[PDB]
Amino acid sequence: FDYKEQLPESAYMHQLLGLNLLFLLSQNRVAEFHTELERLPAKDIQTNVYIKHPVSLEQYLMEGSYNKVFLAKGNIPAESYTFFIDILLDTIRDEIAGCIEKAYEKILFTEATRILFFNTPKKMTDYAKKRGWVLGPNNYYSFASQQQKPEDTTIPSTELAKQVIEYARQLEMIV
Amino acid sequence: VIDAFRLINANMMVLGHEPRQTTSNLGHLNKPSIQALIHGLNRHYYSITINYRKNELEQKMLLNLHKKSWMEGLTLQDYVVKEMLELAKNYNKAVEEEDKMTPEQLAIKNVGKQDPKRHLEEHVDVLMTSNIVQCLAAMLDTVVFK
Known about the structure:
The structure is cut from a larger assembly and holds chains A (175 residues) and B (146 residues). With 175 residues, chain A is mainly alpha-helical.
């Protein structure tokens, strides 16, 4: 941030800004992650391979990191992101959880995300049956009705009648 | 239409018929003035002002028996409503569609010399009251009953 025009180019600075971009994915700051992609437009251009790995990961993330997570994990054995790739493994996305699974789907290993990776072994079971079922809130996935299945009713007409009182009275209130 | 009259004596004619100690009451008496037929036979008589006697509870009972009774005030059931309303709303709107052509004429007209343009067709208040009161039946639908 410091204007410091005299500040020299730093090899540590370029990679760490890229590490920060990966860190934003770890804390799930998606709006910030694009803000960081914006933060270094000249770095992003085409080079800055350290910066490139998180931007490629961002393309994978909107695509769904689960499909390309194996490619992302093996994309660089070491880019100075060795601790950061461990954080990337920590930030493996489990947002695919809102779907039928266990017996109804049985295996979600096809997507290749670490949480749903492995067809049925105890390592898969540990992620799959964590807190009973993955995250653990909601109905058990094995007997889950696809999802929460909340639905809706036309009983709201009485509630809509209450809404009607407020809007209609106002039109009269204006006179 | 009722009016009250008291005769004036011919002997009293030489004297002032009605000396006034109060100007405002004479002014109130002046407001009725005289009727042309009464004027023809006014001589030998003097009109006397008539006012309603004070009415309190008497006014109150008729007042209670006006909107509640003389006018429709069932109140328990005071509140057609959805049967012929659709016909009335369509008919008034149709009259407006023809009537609004006169305002369209005024805006297009240069009207350098002021001319009547049949504006103030209105009916907007009539449509507003009818649609809103019928829409207020929602209170009967879900609140007054269940």
